[PDB]
Design an enzyme around this catalytic site. Sequence first.
Site, PDB file in Angstrom:
ATOM      1  CD  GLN A   1     -12.068  -1.435  27.731  1.00 34.22           C
ATOM      2  OE1 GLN A   1     -11.569  -2.178  28.562  1.00 34.22           O
ATOM      3  NE2 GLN A   1     -12.745  -0.355  28.126  1.00 34.22           N
TER       4      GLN A   1
ATOM      5  N   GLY B   1     -10.401  -0.167  31.176  1.00 33.25           N
ATOM      6  CA  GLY B   1     -10.192  -1.493  31.717  1.00 33.25           C
ATOM      7  C   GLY B   1      -9.162  -1.638  32.791  1.00 33.25           C
TER       8      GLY B   1
ATOM      9  CG  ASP C   1     -15.991   1.588  27.270  1.00 35.74           C
ATOM     10  OD1 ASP C   1     -16.971   2.254  27.704  1.00 35.74           O
ATOM     11  OD2 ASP C   1     -14.907   1.385  27.882  1.00 35.74           O
TER      12      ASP C   1
ATOM     13  CE1 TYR D   1     -15.300   0.761  36.236  1.00 33.63           C
ATOM     14  CE2 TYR D   1     -16.755   2.337  37.194  1.00 33.63           C
ATOM     15  CZ  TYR D   1     -15.743   1.416  37.348  1.00 33.63           C
ATOM     16  OH  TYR D   1     -15.235   1.210  38.613  1.00 33.63           O
TER      17      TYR D   1
ATOM     18  CG  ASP E   1     -12.326   9.980  35.717  1.00 31.36           C
ATOM     19  OD1 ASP E   1     -11.834   9.326  34.762  1.00 31.36           O
ATOM     20  OD2 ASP E   1     -13.190   9.442  36.441  1.00 31.36           O
TER      21      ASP E   1
ATOM     22  CG  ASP F   1     -17.296   7.001  31.333  1.00 32.52           C
ATOM     23  OD1 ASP F   1     -16.975   6.348  32.343  1.00 32.52           O
ATOM     24  OD2 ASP F   1     -17.135   6.561  30.176  1.00 32.52           O
ATOM     25  CB  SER F   2     -19.686   6.254  26.914  1.00 30.58           C
ATOM     26  OG  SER F   2     -18.860   5.215  27.408  1.00 30.58           O
ATOM     27  N   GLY F   3     -21.277   5.636  29.868  1.00 27.72           N
ATOM     28  CA  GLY F   3     -22.163   4.689  30.526  1.00 27.72           C
ATOM     29  C   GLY F   3     -21.578   3.320  30.366  1.00 27.72           C
TER      30      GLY F   3
ATOM     31  CG  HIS G   1      -7.297  19.974  51.849  1.00 18.52           C
ATOM     32  ND1 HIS G   1      -6.174  20.796  51.765  1.00 18.52           N
ATOM     33  CD2 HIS G   1      -6.890  18.713  51.987  1.00 18.52           C
ATOM     34  CE1 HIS G   1      -5.122  20.001  51.866  1.00 18.52           C
ATOM     35  NE2 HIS G   1      -5.531  18.737  51.986  1.00 18.52           N
TER      36      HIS G   1
ATOM     37  CB  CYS H   1      -2.425  23.048  51.259  1.00 25.77           C
ATOM     38  SG  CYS H   1      -3.934  23.126  50.248  1.00 25.77           S
TER      39      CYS H   1
HETATM   40  C1  2MQ Z   1     -12.110   3.514  39.142  1.00 26.76           C
HETATM   41  N1  2MQ Z   1     -11.760   2.705  37.999  1.00 26.76           N
HETATM   42  C2  2MQ Z   1     -12.289   2.786  36.791  1.00 26.76           C
HETATM   43  N2  2MQ Z   1     -11.846   2.052  35.796  1.00 26.76           N
HETATM   44  C3  2MQ Z   1     -12.511   2.438  34.696  1.00 26.76           C
HETATM   45  C4  2MQ Z   1     -12.569   1.900  33.412  1.00 26.76           C
HETATM   46  C5  2MQ Z   1     -13.510   2.458  32.527  1.00 26.76           C
HETATM   47  C6  2MQ Z   1     -13.707   1.904  31.128  1.00 26.76           C
HETATM   48  O1  2MQ Z   1     -12.954   0.987  30.760  1.00 26.76           O
HETATM   49  N3  2MQ Z   1     -14.616   2.454  30.345  1.00 26.76           N
HETATM   50  C7  2MQ Z   1     -15.356   3.477  30.750  1.00 26.76           C
HETATM   51  N4  2MQ Z   1     -16.279   3.955  29.944  1.00 26.76           N
HETATM   52  N5  2MQ Z   1     -15.197   4.019  31.918  1.00 26.76           N
HETATM   53  C8  2MQ Z   1     -14.299   3.565  32.863  1.00 26.76           C
HETATM   54  C9  2MQ Z   1     -14.286   4.036  34.186  1.00 26.76           C
HETATM   55  C10 2MQ Z   1     -15.164   5.187  34.737  1.00 26.76           C
HETATM   56  C11 2MQ Z   1     -14.313   6.522  34.783  1.00 26.76           C
HETATM   57  N6  2MQ Z   1     -14.933   7.430  35.766  1.00 26.76           N
HETATM   58  C12 2MQ Z   1     -13.426   3.410  35.094  1.00 26.76           C
HETATM   59  N7  2MQ Z   1     -13.156   3.651  36.398  1.00 26.76           N
HETATM   60 ZN    ZN Z   2      -5.639  22.940  51.726  1.00 26.30          ZN
END
Ligand code: 2MQ
Ligand code: ZN
Lengths: 368, 368
Positions: free
Chosen positions: B188, B215, B141, B96, B265, B92-94, B334, B303
Site C-alpha cells: 500500500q 491500492g 490488507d 478489497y 488478475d 484474495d484475502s477479502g 475467446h 486467434c
Molecule cells: C480492479 N482493481 C483492483 N484494485 C485492487 C487492489 C486490491 C488491494 O489493494 N488489496 C486487495 N486485497 N485486493 C485488491 C484488488 C482485488 C483483486 N481482484 C483490487 N482490484
Molecule cells: Zn478466439
Amino acid sequence: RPRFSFSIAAREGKARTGTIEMKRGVIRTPAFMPVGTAATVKALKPETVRATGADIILGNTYHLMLRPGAERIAKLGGLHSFMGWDRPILTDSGGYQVMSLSLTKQSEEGVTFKSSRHMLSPERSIEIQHLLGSDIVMAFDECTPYPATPSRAASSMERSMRWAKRSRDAFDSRKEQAENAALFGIQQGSVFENLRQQSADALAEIGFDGYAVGGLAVGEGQDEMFRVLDFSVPMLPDDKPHYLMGVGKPDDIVGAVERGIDMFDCVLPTRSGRNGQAFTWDGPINIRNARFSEDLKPLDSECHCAVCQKWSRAYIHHLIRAGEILGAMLMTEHNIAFYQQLMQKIRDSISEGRFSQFAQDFRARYFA
Amino acid sequence: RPRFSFSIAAREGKARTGTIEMKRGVIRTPAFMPVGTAATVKALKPETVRATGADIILGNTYHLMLRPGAERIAKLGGLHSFMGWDRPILTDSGGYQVMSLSLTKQSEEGVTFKSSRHMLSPERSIEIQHLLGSDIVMAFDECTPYPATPSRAASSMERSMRWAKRSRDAFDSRKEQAENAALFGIQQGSVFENLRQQSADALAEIGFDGYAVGGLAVGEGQDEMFRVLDFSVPMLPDDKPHYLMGVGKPDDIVGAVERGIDMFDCVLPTRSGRNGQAFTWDGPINIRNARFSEDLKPLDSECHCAVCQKWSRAYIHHLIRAGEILGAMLMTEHNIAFYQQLMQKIRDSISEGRFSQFAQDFRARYFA
Ligand SMILES: CNc1nc2cc3c(=O)[nH]c(N)nc3c(CCN)c2[nH]1
Ligand SMILES: [Zn+2]
Ligand SMILES: CNc1nc2cc3c(=O)[nH]c(N)nc3c(CCN)c2[nH]1
Ligand SMILES: [Zn+2]
C-alpha cells in the site's frame, strides 16, 4: 447416404428400433431430438450435444424467422453452418409456436401475427425451412387446442389436411429441397378416433417420408394421450417413422415407444435443467433443495455423462443457487445425456426382445 | 515440485519471464489469472479454462465465505476438488471485496460487515484461505480509496503492515498451510513514493514468498498507475514475484510488465465478454453492434482459440442479442484465450529480447 431411408431392424409388440439414413447422417430410432429453438441447444456447444449421443436436433421456423431471420441465415450459409451442427436437423413448421407465443389472424391462406407484422402459410413455411437448410421439413399445420369439440377438431383437421397437400406441393416444386430433404406430414383430430383415421388416410394418400402425431401433449394428460396413441399410431403407415411432437417426460417416452413412436422432441431436459431439475433413474430431483448442499454423490449414480464423472450434487447445488452459468451448462448436459441414455436403453432392449421388461423395471424404479 | 520456487529465465529492462513451481503445478510468468469468484470462472468448465492456457486461477475469500461457506468447502474436500480445478489457486484475502461490495465496521482487529453478520481479521482471513485449500494466500490488507490524502494513506498503509505481520504469523502457525502453500504480502501507500517505500521495507522485513502492488486500478487512470509503478516495483525484492492486483486491460498489462510485474488478475475478459465486448489485436469490438450481423469472419483474425476456429461474428452477435447462454460461453472462452495469448506473446518476446518491439507493435495495432 440416400436422401432418406428408414429401416426397422427389430420389433417387440408395437415398439420398433432401426435407423433413418440421410445425407448428413444416421439417426438411431427411437430417437430423442434436443431442441435448439434460437439456433442453439441452450447452454451447450454442438460438440457437447453430439457427445451426449444425439443424432439430430430440432430447430423452429417461428423463432428463427423472427431472429435472426430465414433469409439472413441462408445468406450466411444455412443453419448447419451458422450454428456448427453438421448432422441432421428437423424443423417444426411454425403454427404450433405461432399460436403458442404470438397477436394473430387465421385464414385458409395461413396466419398473420405479431412477434413487426409477420405471415406464415404452407408455402412460406416450406420456403423458410428450405432457407434454413432443414433436413426433415414438417408440413404446416394447425395444432387443435385441447379440449376441442368434435366439430372444431374436424374443421381444424380438415384445414390441416388441405395445408398438408399444399406443403407437399410446395416442397416438391423446389428441386434442391425435394432431392436433399425429407417431408413429414402431421396427423390431427384431437382425441377423436374417427378424425384421427380420416387424417391418417388423407396424409397417406398424399404420401410423406414420415408421419407425426400432432395435437397431443397440449393439456390432456398421460392417460388420455396414451389412449389416443393406442388407436392413432396403427393408422399411420408402418414402414415410415412415427414422430410424437413435444413429448416428453421419461415415462411418456417409454409408453409412447410401447405404442409405436419412433421420434421425440421436448424442451423438458434443457428448460428444467436450467431450473434445477435433474433427471435420475430413481426419478427427478431438484438440485436447489437444501438436502443436496453437502452431497458429494454425482447427480445420478449410474450416469456415464461427463458431469457425473467430475462434479458433485453439492457443487451443482451451489452453482444453481448462485445463478451461475456453469450450473445451467452442467445440468443441461446431464439431462440431455440422461435422455440419450434412456433412448439407448430402449433401443438395446427392443433389439434384444426385452423392452417390456425394461419398461416395467424402469417404471418401478423411477417411481419408487 | 517444491512448495514454492520462482526462477527468472530471461529479462529485458525491467521485464522478466520465468516460472513459479508449486506442488499443484507450474505457473509461467508473466501470468494472467482468470477470476473465479463463486468457485467458477463464469461460463467456463475448468478444462476449458486450462485449454486456453491458464496455469492458475483466482478465488475470493469474501464471496466464498458467504456462499457456499469456507467450512462447508473444507468439509467437501477443499476448493480444488469442489470446482474441479486441480492446478494452483490464488485467493484474495477479502477487504478489497468487503469494502467494495458490503454494511461495515472497521477497527484495528479487522472488519465486521453485512453481506447475516460476518467478520474478517488477519487471522480469520488466513484461516478461510486454509479451509479453501488456497495455494497462494494473500495477506489481509486495507485497500486505500483513491484519492487519498497523505495522512489517510499513511494511516491505512501502517495498519496494513501491522496486518501483514499478523497474516505472516497466522500462516506460519498453521503447519500444513506453511508447508504446502505460499504467502504474498501487499504493498500500500496510495500514489505516494515515500509511503510505498515504507511499505515495501516493512513487507521485506517480515518476508513473503511474493509481493503484490495493492491500492491501484481504483480510479487513478493509466498514466498515474504507471507513474506509481515506475517507482514502486523496484522497491520490492527483485527475486520474488510481483503481482499487480486487479489489472487489467491489455495495454495496462503490457505496460505493467514493462515496469516489472509478473502476475495479473482481472474480471474484464469474463465480465465484458458476457456483455458483448470481444478483445482482438486490432482493439476491442462490441459484438452486439449491427455491423456484425452478417459478418462471417471469426471474432479475431489470428486467434487460435476454438471459438475463432468454429463460429462467426454473425452467430455470436445473434447469440448475445438473444441473451443465449452459449453467447456468454463463446465470448468468455475467446476473451480468456486472447488474454492467455497476450501473455504467451509477452513471455516469448522477453525470452527473445524483443519485448520492447513487441509492446510498440502491439500498441500501434491495437490502437490503430
Ligand atoms: C480492479 N482493481 C483492483 N484494485 C485492487 C487492489 C486490491 C488491494 O489493494 N488489496 C486487495 N486485497 N485486493 C485488491 C484488488 C482485488 C483483486 N481482484 C483490487 N482490484
Ligand atoms: Zn478466439
Ligand atoms: C409440448 N407439446 C406439444 N404438442 C405439440 C403439437 C404440435 C402440432 O400438433 N403441430 C406442430 N407443428 N407442432 C407441435 C408441437 C411443437 C413440437 N416442438 C407440440 N408440442
Ligand atoms: Zn450425468
